[PDB]
Amino acid sequence: MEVIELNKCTSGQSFEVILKPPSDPSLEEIQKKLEAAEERRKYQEAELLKHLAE
Amino acid sequence: MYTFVVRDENSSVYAEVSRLLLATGQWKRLRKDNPRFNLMLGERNRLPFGRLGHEPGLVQLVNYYRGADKLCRKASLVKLIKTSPELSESCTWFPESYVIYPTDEREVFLAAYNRRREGREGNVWIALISSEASELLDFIDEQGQVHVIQKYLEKPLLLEPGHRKFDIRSWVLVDHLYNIYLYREGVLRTSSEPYNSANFQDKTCHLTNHCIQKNYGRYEEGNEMFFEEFNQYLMDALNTTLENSILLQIKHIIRSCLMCIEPAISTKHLHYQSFQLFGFDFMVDEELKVWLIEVNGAPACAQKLYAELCQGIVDVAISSVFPLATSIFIKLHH
Amino acid sequence: MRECISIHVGQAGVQIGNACWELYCLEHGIQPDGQMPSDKTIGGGDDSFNTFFSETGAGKHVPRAVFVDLEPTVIDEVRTGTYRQLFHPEQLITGKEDAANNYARGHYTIGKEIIDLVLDRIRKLADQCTGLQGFLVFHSFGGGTGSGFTSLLMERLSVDYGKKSKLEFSIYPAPQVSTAVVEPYNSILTTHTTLEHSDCAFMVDNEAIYDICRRNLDIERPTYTNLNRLISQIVSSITASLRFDGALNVDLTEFQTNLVPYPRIHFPLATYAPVISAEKAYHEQLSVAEITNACFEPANQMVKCDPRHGKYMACCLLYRGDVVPKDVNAAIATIKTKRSIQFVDWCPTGFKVGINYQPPTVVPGGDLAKVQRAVCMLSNTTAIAEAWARLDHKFDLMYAKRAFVHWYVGEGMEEGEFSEAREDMAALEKDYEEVGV
Amino acid sequence: MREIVHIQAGQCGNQIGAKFWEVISDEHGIDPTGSYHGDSDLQLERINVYYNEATGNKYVPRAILVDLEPGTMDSVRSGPFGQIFRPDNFVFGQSGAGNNWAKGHYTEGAELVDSVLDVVRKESESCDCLQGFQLTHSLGGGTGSGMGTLLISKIREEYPDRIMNTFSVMPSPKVSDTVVEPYNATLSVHQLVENTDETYCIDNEALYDICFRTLKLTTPTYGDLNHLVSATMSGVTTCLRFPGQLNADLRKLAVNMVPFPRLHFFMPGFAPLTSRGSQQYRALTVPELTQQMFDSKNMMAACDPRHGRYLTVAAIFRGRMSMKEVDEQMLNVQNKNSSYFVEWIPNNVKTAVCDIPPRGLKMSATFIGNSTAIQELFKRISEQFTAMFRRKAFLHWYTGEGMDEMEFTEAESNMNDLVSEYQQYQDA
Numbered sequence A: 001m002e003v004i005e006l007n008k009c010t011s012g013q014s015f016e017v018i019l020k021p022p023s024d025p026s027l028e029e030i031q032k033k034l035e036a037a038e039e040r041r042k043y044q045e046a047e048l049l050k051h052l053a054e
Numbered sequence B: 001m002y003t004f005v006v007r008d009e010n011s012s013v014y015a016e017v018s019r020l021l022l023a024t025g026q027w028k029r030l031r032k033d034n035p036r037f038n039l040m041l042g043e044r045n046r047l048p049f050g051r052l053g054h055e056p057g058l059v060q061l062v063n064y065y066r067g068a069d070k071l072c073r074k075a076s077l078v079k080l081i082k083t084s085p086e087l088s089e090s091c092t093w094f095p096e097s098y099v100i101y102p103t104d105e106r107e108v109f110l111a112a113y114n115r116r117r118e119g120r121e122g123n124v125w126i127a128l129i130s131s132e133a134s135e136l137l138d139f140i141d142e143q144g145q146v147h148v149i150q151k152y153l154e155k156p157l158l159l160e161p162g163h164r165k166f167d168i169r170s171w172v173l174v175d176h177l178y179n180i181y182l183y184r185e186g187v188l189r190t191s192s193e194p195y196n197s198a199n200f201q202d203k204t205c206h207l208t209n210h211c212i213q214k215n216y217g218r219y220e221e222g223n224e225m226f227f228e229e230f231n232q233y234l235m236d237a238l239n240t241t242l243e244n245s246i247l248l249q250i251k252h253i254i255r256s257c258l259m260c261i262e263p264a265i266s267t268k269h270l271h272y273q274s275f276q277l278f279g280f281d282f283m284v285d286e287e288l289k290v291w292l293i294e295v296n297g298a299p300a301c302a303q304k305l306y307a308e309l310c311q312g313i314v315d316v317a318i319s320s321v322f323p324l325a326t327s328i329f330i331k332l333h334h
Numbered sequence C: 001m002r003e004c005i006s007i008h009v010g011q012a013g014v015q016i017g018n019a020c021w022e023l024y025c026l027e028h029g030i031q032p033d034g035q036m037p038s039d040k041t042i043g044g045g046d047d048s049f050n051t052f053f054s055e056t057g058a059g060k061h062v063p064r065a066v067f068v069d070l071e072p073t074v075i076d077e078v079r080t081g082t083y084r085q086l087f088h089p090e091q092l093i094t095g096k097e098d099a100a101n102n103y104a105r106g107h108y109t110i111g112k113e114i115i116d117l118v119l120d121r122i123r124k125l126a127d128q129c130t131g132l133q134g135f136l137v138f139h140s141f142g143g144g145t146g147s148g149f150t151s152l153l154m155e156r157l158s159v160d161y162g163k164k165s166k167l168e169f170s171i172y173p174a175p176q177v178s179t180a181v182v183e184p185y186n187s188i189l190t191t192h193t194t195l196e197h198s199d200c201a202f203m204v205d206n207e208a209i210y211d212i213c214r215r216n217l218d219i220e221r222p223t224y225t226n227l228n229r230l231i232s233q234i235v236s237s238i239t240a241s242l243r244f245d246g247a248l249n250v251d252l253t254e255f256q257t258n259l260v261p262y263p264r265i266h267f268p269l270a271t272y273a274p275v276i277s278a279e280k281a282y283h284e285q286l287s288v289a290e291i292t293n294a295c296f297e298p299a300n301q302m303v304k305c306d307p308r309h310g311k312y313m314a315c316c317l318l319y320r321g322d323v324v325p326k327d328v329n330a331a332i333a334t335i336k337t338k339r340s341i342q343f344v345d346w347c348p349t350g351f352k353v354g355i356n357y358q359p360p361t362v363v364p365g366g367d368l369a370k371v372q373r374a375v376c377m378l379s380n381t382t383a384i385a386e387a388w389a390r391l392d393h394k395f396d397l398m399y400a401k402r403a404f405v406h407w408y409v410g411e412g413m414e415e416g417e418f419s420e421a422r423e424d425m426a427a428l429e430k431d432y433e434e435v436g437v
Numbered sequence D: 001m002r003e004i005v006h007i008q009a010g011q012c013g014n015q016i017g018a019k020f021w022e023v024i025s026d027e028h029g030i031d032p033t034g035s036y037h038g039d040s041d042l043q044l045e046r047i048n049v050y051y052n053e054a055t056g057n058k059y060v061p062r063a064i065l066v067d068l069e070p071g072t073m074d075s076v077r078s079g080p081f082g083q084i085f086r087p088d089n090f091v092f093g094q095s096g097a098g099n100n101w102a103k104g105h106y107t108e109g110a111e112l113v114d115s116v117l118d119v120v121r122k123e124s125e126s127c128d129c130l131q132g133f134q135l136t137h138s139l140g141g142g143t144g145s146g147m148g149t150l151l152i153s154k155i156r157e158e159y160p161d162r163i164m165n166t167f168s169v170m171p172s173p174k175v176s177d178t179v180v181e182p183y184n185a186t187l188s189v190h191q192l193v194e195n196t197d198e199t200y201c202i203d204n205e206a207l208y209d210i211c212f213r214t215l216k217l218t219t220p221t222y223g224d225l226n227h228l229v230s231a232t233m234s235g236v237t238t239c240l241r242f243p244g245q246l247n248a249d250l251r252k253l254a255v256n257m258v259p260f261p262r263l264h265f266f267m268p269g270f271a272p273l274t275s276r277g278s279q280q281y282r283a284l285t286v287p288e289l290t291q292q293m294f295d296s297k298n299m300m301a302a303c304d305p306r307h308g309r310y311l312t313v314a315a316i317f318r319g320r321m322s323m324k325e326v327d328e329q330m331l332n333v334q335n336k337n338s339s340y341f342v343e344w345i346p347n348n349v350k351t352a353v354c355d356i357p358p359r360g361l362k363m364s365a366t367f368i369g370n371s372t373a374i375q376e377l378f379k380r381i382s383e384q385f386t387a388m389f390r391r392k393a394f395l396h397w398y399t400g401e402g403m404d405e406m407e408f409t410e411a412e413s414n415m416n417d418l419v420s421e422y423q424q425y426q427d428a
């Protein structure tokens, strides 16, 4: 129906066509999530080594 | 060896299909959540169409058309007939209907309604049945969900002896290639207690369901007249045939409805395939003019016809896609 | 001119990257040397291609790219392959042992030990940019590095470059070429964590690309090379407006503006046509009407789904080759009467159209045929939520039994991150259904 | 460089281990002296997974030969490939273990274990990025079962974040008449449930039955059994040794195969089943490989796959064939036999193809299944065990080495729990 915004250049052209109208955590918080994961991981390993020492 | 899953256990129609598929010895039923099926006999509501057709090395087929609800819900059908140019407001075979939301086109309804008062012509409408508007709007507001105000047909065709109202049920099967197959056997679901013009209170002579008729079963077995007897009645009493007086109009209505939605629901170039059995409900007036009442997406069959119909669903809808190791349908050509 | 940094994470990201940069070099007439005979400003410039390529005093054109993987094998093939002198060794970052198809291992265990080094090398490219606009991040949903490390990187990029846009090219898992049974887990995890940090994300289902390669390129069993060279065409069609003179999608903010009105629903569907086998002789060239009509076939889409049962909230057509506006608008008129194209009520029914007169470049001796005109449609449709439903179902089947969860808990992830991720996806599926019906 | 350290313990372990090294050295074109004499760079690309590269251009297996008696290792040293192994990696005592798990684990084996760990340490230090360990051993004897499990426990203490992989030979009364083998096997399984990530259950019951029934060898030798073990070991390690997309290392394999940490006992398969010297002149079709590899008669664990469900499966095809046809055939197996693959792990079968076949076969297929039917193997051991243990028979051989009845009860409990755990997921 209606063409608008027609822009042309040597490489090509572009436009819009309408048929019908309408009707972030901080650096700190990231580190505390990574470090807690590492502490849970290191607690698992220490508990394993405790069991093996027994 | 083909495989299938059953996800609606209430389906009288597709219980018989599964039983017949197992009886062939080339189909195996899997448990409902096993995804590695060729055929899904799917659930009524919330069917997971988005999960179909993503299983490598399996051609997958389902017994519903996604988007068929637009034809099979009452409010959707009215909207579909009104807004689709191929059917349009000018559609001669669908009664004048209006979508009415409780507390929309209530304003457009009242304009046409109050024209009929000045016109001095029959002004009865169905939701349920009444001639005054004040009763109908107030009935919807205090009820719950959305309803449809549809023109009630004052002058039905009536069977004799007994002066009785009726509707016709036609079963249609639409396969994966979008062939439209009308089953040759339909059925008249009749009234038993005679049709009264003044008495709208007794909702038995006015509403012709198989269940609501519960005198009963006097004229025929279970208020079900089949097409041989109804054709004979038409030949004797009216000097016409079923084929000529009613069935051409049914064929026309069915094909018009299904062609209109073919672009929206066809599975022709899709990653899964669909078929579906529909039940069209037809009213016939005194001039032998046919009228569409509704379309049912999950119809039941009449007790006599189950064996034949379900074997036909297997032959044309399933074994067409999944072949194994005298045609009951009429192909509606388009 | 405003620079764009590409980041390639994991095997998929890395290997798709190579396909993309090979194709970019061919499109611009840049050689493996890095020399670009046609470029007359030596040692610098503010040309459109300089968005993707910096320049040295010796005349070498060098990608604004970092490749990061937690295992050397695939990045070693970049270091020793055809385009090796194109890249500076600080752009190619490798670990020793990979993430073992484990989000948690990529995100927490190895992510913590490698993240500062990757931001350092990204910062060395940002420093030599006059006006950095943002990042194009390539990765799989299914690999541990692709899922786990990428989601961490994205969180950090929000901190260190808050004002800058971030686009994704994400590879959605498919059993026909998948390497792990926990890819649903990894996909849900990385999607939950990356959702707030991505402005616009282009999902390519490997199932779609695999089938397109069988059906239309007559390839019996597609390899990653077959898949990636097709992916690279779609990616190039999408990035062409950044690398070439034009007035549609010329900066990263325009992708968001034109395709993504709701921030969460930022997953536009890509559809590409035509895809024609090279070894096919006698091929009837497809018209503007025919390739534009092919943009509404599920079989040409990057994700198999049904736009008919859904609603559009934006639609771009990006043409490459012999095309004029007259024939595009004629094609749209036909198409609108024949097909189901509902927009949401609050957007205009309409199409933004970009044409570049140069037809698509093909990799010589490849699988794709040269063609006179091609198109990529970018449509934000709610039908893409089907992809989320499938993935969410596979997740539920495994998670109800806690199958493989111990692998993730073993790397320090809490069992609750699974169900948080899952109910975020439940909310996403609900957002799509609310908009779409 | 993603290195695996190999350890072989006891008669059985050293015998199947020696045969593993003969077979893979031949596939990689390494001769008995360590020299490469192959005709393809695919042989050398991932040679460092199993071989150290010494001066010259010599390749030395990253292999540690362990026993409490000298016989089998003198036999391995004297054998054709014996010169390939590092001489300092032979660690052996003189006493023997007398087919006694307590002697291997606690008394005789305790005396030798630190000198084994020194060799393991030296091999591990030399690795750019060690991925883990593979052990070969029987569960029915003394050294391999008792000392093998002690070694696993010690290695885990030093290297707790590396993968532990075993090839564990299960005892059968068809092969051995030693009365106490169920005791040794139950004690060893208790160890394996706690301290391994992946265990290949190589069942002598199955190996014997295959040799007798299918191969028509009426008097099978250990050599005939081992021929089937060496082929399986080639097959299941292909993805670790050649360039490949699927299960390319031990950890990724574990993440694909082990949905719950205890349920890590695998049922391997192989097609075609051959005997030594009897030539397969006819190459198998992709359809036949696929039927046979899933067939109960091709399983190296005596378990009926139809009595359980597959949690996970890895199928690996070798030789030059159609990838299209492999995919079709693998999809065909799991769609036709759908009820045997748990619906709650989607897409649980993974397929790999390697261009290079084994010696003497053009085509081959190796199966790795985590099936709930493996419970039948443990149930058989458990029944044999309980029959003796309920009367405390032969127990003085173990208490005389310092063990208590409580250990036996605990081991019995843990294995019976394993069995019911498989049953739990079979009915889910």
Ligand SMILES: CCCCCCN(C(=O)[C@@H](NC(=O)[C@H]1CCCCN1C)[C@@H](C)CC)[C@H](C[C@@H](OC(C)=O)c1nc(C(=O)N[C@@H](Cc2ccc(F)cc2)C[C@H](C)C(=O)O)cs1)C(C)C
Residues within 6 Å of the ligand: D011, D012, D015, D173, D174, D175, D176, D177, D219, D220, D221, D222, D223, D224, D225
């Ligand atoms: C002295 C204790 C040995 C126990 C041997 C068990 N086996 C038997 O046939 C024995 N039968 C039994 O034990 C029966 C009888 C009672 C009822 C049930 N039991 C199991 C006979 C040898 C008894 C007379 C065979 C193994 C046996 O086979 C023979 C001789 O027919 C042996 N095989 C070998 C063997 O394989 N030797 C290898 C070298 C080797 C390999 C493995 C080793 F562990 C040792 C040496 C060289 C040969 C040429 C080869 O490659 O085939 C050595 S002893 C089992 C597979 C059932």
Ligand SMILES: Nc1nc2c(ncn2[C@@H]2O[C@H](COP(=O)(O)OP(=O)(O)OP(=O)(O)O)[C@@H](O)[C@H]2O)c(=O)[nH]1
Residues within 6 Å of the ligand: C009, C010, C011, C012, C013, C015, C016, C069, C070, C098, C099, C100, C101, C102, C106, C139, C140, C141, C142, C143, C144, C145, C146, C147, C171, C172, C173, C174, C177, C178, C179, C183, C206, C224, C227, C228, C231
């Ligand atoms: N299209 C395409 N998909 C790929 C490619 N490589 C891997 N994939 C897919 O990505 C998923 C596997 O993730 P990868 O990217 O290989 O894993 P990764 O990011 O290296 O992570 P880890 O190896 O776990 O550390 C699967 O769905 C693969 O099919 C590729 O080159 N092209």
Ligand SMILES: Nc1ncnc2c1ncn2[C@@H]1O[C@H](COP(=O)(O)OP(=O)(O)CP(=O)(O)O)[C@@H](O)[C@H]1O
Residues within 6 Å of the ligand: B095, B126, B150, B151, B152, B153, B166, B167, B206, B207, B208, B209, B281, B283, B293, B294, B296
């Ligand atoms: N406009 C109209 N004129 C005359 N009769 C009508 C009518 N609308 C409905 N009826 C009568 O009412 C009966 C039932 O109508 P309808 O099928 O719309 O309700 P329904 O959908 O709840 C039954 P079911 O749920 O079993 O499909 C019909 O059999 C018909 O006789």
Ligand SMILES: Nc1nc2c(ncn2[C@@H]2O[C@H](COP(=O)(O)OP(=O)(O)O)[C@@H](O)[C@H]2O)c(=O)[nH]1
Residues within 6 Å of the ligand: D009, D010, D011, D012, D013, D015, D016, D097, D098, D099, D100, D137, D138, D139, D140, D141, D142, D143, D144, D145, D169, D170, D171, D172, D175, D176, D181, D204, D207, D222, D223, D225, D226
């Ligand atoms: N398949 C196979 N089984 C063996 C071999 N040698 C011994 N066995 C079995 O292993 C068990 C005895 O263990 P063995 O390794 O000899 O004792 P160890 O020397 O103390 O470890 C019995 O079940 C034997 O049948 C062999 O070479 N191959």
Ligand SMILES: [Ca+2]
Residues within 6 Å of the ligand: C039, C040, C041, C042, C043, C044, C045, C046, C047, C055
């Ligand atoms: Ca320049």
Ligand SMILES: [Mg+2]
Residues within 6 Å of the ligand: C010, C011, C071, C098, C143, C145
């Ligand atoms: Mg990787």
Ligand SMILES: [Mg+2]
Residues within 6 Å of the ligand: D011, D141
């Ligand atoms: Mg011995």
